[PDB]
Design a protein around this ligand. Structure first.
Ligand SMILES: [Co+2]
Length: 9
C-alpha cells in the first residue's frame, strides 16, 4: 500500500 500511494502521487 505504501508504494501504491507513492505511485499515485
Ligand atoms: Co517513494
Amino acid at each position: 500500500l505504501a508504494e501504491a500511494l507513492h505511485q499515485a502521487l
